[PDB]
Design a binder for this molecule. Sequence first.
Ligand SMILES: Cc1cc2nc3c(=O)[nH]c(=O)nc-3n(C[C@H](O)[C@H](O)[C@H](O)COP(=O)(O)OP(=O)(O)OC[C@H]3O[C@@H](n4cnc5c(N)ncnc54)[C@H](O)[C@@H]3O)c2cc1C
Ligand SMILES: Cc1cc2nc3c(=O)[nH]c(=O)nc-3n(C[C@H](O)[C@H](O)[C@H](O)COP(=O)(O)OP(=O)(O)OC[C@H]3O[C@@H](n4cnc5c(N)ncnc54)[C@H](O)[C@@H]3O)c2cc1C
Ligand SMILES: CCCCCCCCCCCCCCCCO
Ligand SMILES: CCCCCCCCCCCCCCCCO
Lengths: 523, 523
Amino acid sequence: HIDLYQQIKWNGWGDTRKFLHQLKPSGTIAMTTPEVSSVPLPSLRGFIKKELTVLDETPALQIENIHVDPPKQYPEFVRELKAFFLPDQLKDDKLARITHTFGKSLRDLIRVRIGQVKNAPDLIVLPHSHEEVERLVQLAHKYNVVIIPMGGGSNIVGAIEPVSNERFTVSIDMRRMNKVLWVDRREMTACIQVGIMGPELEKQLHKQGVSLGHDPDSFEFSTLGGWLATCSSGHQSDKYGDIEDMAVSFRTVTPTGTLELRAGINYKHIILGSEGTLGIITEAVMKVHAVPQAVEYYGFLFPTFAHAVSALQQIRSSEVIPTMIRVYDPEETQLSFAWKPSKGSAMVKKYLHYIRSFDFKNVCLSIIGFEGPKKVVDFHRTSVFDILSKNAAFGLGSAPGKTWAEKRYDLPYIRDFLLDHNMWVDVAETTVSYANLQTLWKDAKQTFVKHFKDQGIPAWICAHISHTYTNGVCLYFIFASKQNEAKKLMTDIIFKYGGSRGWINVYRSLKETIDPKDICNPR
Amino acid sequence: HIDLYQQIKWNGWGDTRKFLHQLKPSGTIAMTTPEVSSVPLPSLRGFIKKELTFVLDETPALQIENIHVDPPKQYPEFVRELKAFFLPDQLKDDKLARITHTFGKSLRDLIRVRIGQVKNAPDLIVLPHSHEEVERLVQLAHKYNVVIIPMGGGSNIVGAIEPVSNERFTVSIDMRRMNKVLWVDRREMTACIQVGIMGPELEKQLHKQGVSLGHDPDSFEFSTLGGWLATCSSGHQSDKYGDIEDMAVSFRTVTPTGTLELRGINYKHIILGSEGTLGIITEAVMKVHAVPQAVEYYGFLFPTFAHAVSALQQIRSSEVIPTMIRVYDPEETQLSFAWKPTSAMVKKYLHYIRSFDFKNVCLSIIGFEGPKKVVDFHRTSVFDILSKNAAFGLGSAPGKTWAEKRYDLPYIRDFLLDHNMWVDVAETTVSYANLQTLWKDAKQTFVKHFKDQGIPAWICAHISHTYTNGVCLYFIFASKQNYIEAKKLMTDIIFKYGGSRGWINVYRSLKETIDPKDICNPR
Ligand SMILES: Cc1cc2nc3c(=O)[nH]c(=O)nc-3n(C[C@H](O)[C@H](O)[C@H](O)COP(=O)(O)OP(=O)(O)OC[C@H]3O[C@@H](n4cnc5c(N)ncnc54)[C@H](O)[C@@H]3O)c2cc1C
Ligand SMILES: Cc1cc2nc3c(=O)[nH]c(=O)nc-3n(C[C@H](O)[C@H](O)[C@H](O)COP(=O)(O)OP(=O)(O)OC[C@H]3O[C@@H](n4cnc5c(N)ncnc54)[C@H](O)[C@@H]3O)c2cc1C
Ligand SMILES: CCCCCCCCCCCCCCCCO
Ligand SMILES: CCCCCCCCCCCCCCCCO
């Protein structure tokens, strides 16, 4: 047995066996993966050179060179844990502790990379079942011990990081509770241990003919319980609904008892989005759907960002909407084509041909997907394609199943490579009305570029649209520079374009009732 | 100015100017409406004779002057403070005012008001004009320790507005003068709406601005937005427009400890479905939709209930669903045709039942709304499934009128109560597996328990909602007056076929925190 915390990078993203690196002789960048031989990416080096000027090397510290204060001691608590849990279910070695300290924001990565580990948990517990979680929480309440559940640790808001250090603190790693317990194909529901990781969930559901359909960009390295405790957004939500809609019921172990769910109050909304501050979700009954009989993904190009946005609007107004759509601005478009694996070219050829008639400085890629019954897919496809025709979309063709849409999963791998070579990249996500969209998009990019160009520093910024609403979009900025304010600059300008409480007392009452001792992820 | 409570029947349903009545000496039953007087329904007398055996015995309700209501309690300091802020026309404590703010519209309610049994009246009715006036009232009620119970249409059937005890001075806050749409945002597709607005008034005001809400409970005509919110009522176009909680973007709620405003935890769900126990909703921002370009409603006949249910199942599995569907069992089908003042529908049904025994034939009404292209796609998909299940087409008729006859049914209850009869309902969710046997067994058990006694009884059902593995089955059962003997019998057989709490302590802390003195609809 290797635990997930050992298989996922302790100072970067995702699988330890998957990473970008440079190949001899010429410094070609290549993607190593566990299943496939290293795949060269011939254009990527040239792209990084163009946009941001040998690559300077800035390796992270090795784990033996990282100092972590010894764990606190709580002999009597630990004794009671020892009497119930197996030895392999309790860890306090350095690796264990570091990996249960940090999420995956840039702030986390920077800090772990330079060895700044100021508030590790004292102990990691890996329970096997709901009944073991109940015992652990019983004991944590009895002894006044802080508990912080962790799934993938992919959050970017510091949600798993211990805040204080007065009490003994335990990280409850949920990832050994990773079984689909049953699938009811008549109710179309599945009961699922929430420590399960995205691709493991989908693989186990597929075996029974079903799927969940929740697809955040962190799909590969985040868990069902994490999705539920954060209310994360998914990129097939137009078809399958938001996570809160997919959640029929779930069990929550709290300091004051297990809370069970089945015109009055709908109590699931008290726990969804609570970030481990109100107890530990253990098992969830989720709404599933039959594996779709038709799955079709298509790429398109638009002469400008304005044409794409226009199609986005018209598609939404026609009321016949794709399962997934994403629109890439010209910079993210160029990055998408610069990332063309020579191993493992037809659409790269269509893009090169297109950019002879239309300026590449302006060309946007769109990826559009459809799933469902053949008849439904056919109707939706034909409806959207007709709207695409009216907005000067140029078709790049299909490719086959879902893999046009699983290339967003590779992006965080690029961040690690950048961090290793004197660069950083960060993101800002905003909702913005169509009225302000093209003006904020243009102004944010020009402002950010010029602020670094005016100091003699290279800097690059792209954007994509991932979600559309009645009167707006979700706009996602990615911005990169060289290692030496930039967050504040993007934030100020987002606010300057309309881009995105007695309830405190209601929450306080819930929290004091549910968690009298404030042991649950105290904030 | 006439208040809504003066325009709605104080001892029956709906508009004081609309009712069924018996013409004399002919005995023909007729329907009066404020637009046309005494429209004969030539088949309805014969239907009533057939099913429940010809002179109708008369059982008139008591006149209001013959009804005793204990005088209001007095609370001079409280009332003095109210009198300083509220206009005299806003405060009522006459008998009519007290009676119409005591009872809902359940059978138990109607029975009690009709024999003059008024045990628990509020002491005062307050009709506020604005959010700011509700805030003052709730402040004053908390200061003086005065129970407050908000009311909309008073259409609920669970005793939700009926004062429970008489220790404290009790006020009914009639929301119905707060009945304006305050704005419509047609780019966002939201409207801000004072929640005392009645259903048809809401849709009329929204239509003026090119939008619609689409929430449609069977009580639509005489219930309010605030009632829908505070009860999470179900609506019969929800497959298309979503549930009331999905339509609710935000709202303001005035509580004994402050006004709770809405834009982690999604707090709206603490208040939706709270039945006035956690404060008073005053204004809501609701999701609206453009008035649809196509609205098409069709009728179909099926040779048996089993065929109809089959079509229901296969329609849902096809994933292409109508806006509204209802399936009427053979007894409710017969009632629907016997309720005839369209004449072409009767003609087709009469012809069909020459080929198929009428004792088995079920009517279905199926509607589609949306963009023409969407309506066309859904119509043609559903029509073809309907072919596979022996559905016979009755045609259309024009707009939504096929679908607004359900609004007239409670008017029939009043007429029955005036003629030595009663009628009640039980709704249940039930799996497709148990559906047909619960349907057959409930109907048969119910008639036999009365026929064994030498007493007429009639029972029908319809299906109003379908789910993945089930339906919502609605029973309507009627007999002669001589409720609790036959309701229990139904209640038991539903419980038989699988027909449709540490959270209590969560609720208690919310309620103790929000409403320390327990003035909000104390239970
Ligand atoms: C590259 C990248 C892409 C991302 N893309 C998206 C995206 O598209 N949409 C989106 O919303 N987010 C996205 N995120 C953020 C993040 O992945 C999501 O919030 C995700 O839901 C976190 O899941 P997790 O299993 O990693 O939770 P963790 O990081 O382990 O925990 C998050 C919170 O949930 C709590 N928690 C975990 N398990 C439980 C449990 N069983 N019971 C109670 N509380 C629990 C933790 O205490 C913590 O407060 C992204 C992050 C990265 C780094
Ligand atoms: C013939 C008939 C058909 C029906 N059909 C349906 C149906 O299809 N679907 C369904 O769900 N129900 C149905 N019902 C029940 C009922 O009409 C609904 O529950 C409706 O939502 C109640 O609305 P109302 O305005 O009359 O509320 P009321 O009866 O006035 O009040 C109901 C509850 O909500 C509270 N309330 C009212 N206003 C506020 C406010 N502003 N703030 C806080 N609390 C408030 C009251 O205190 C009470 O607790 C039906 C009832 C009848 C008689
Ligand atoms: C500098 C030119 C090369 C382009 C840089 C590639 C962009 C890398 C995107 C990585 C995004 C990972 C961040 C996830 C969001 C959470 O913090
Ligand atoms: C023999 C003809 C019978 C006519 C049937 C009329 C159905 C009347 C429906 C009454 C609506 C009742 C809903 C509230 C329930 C109260 O307890």
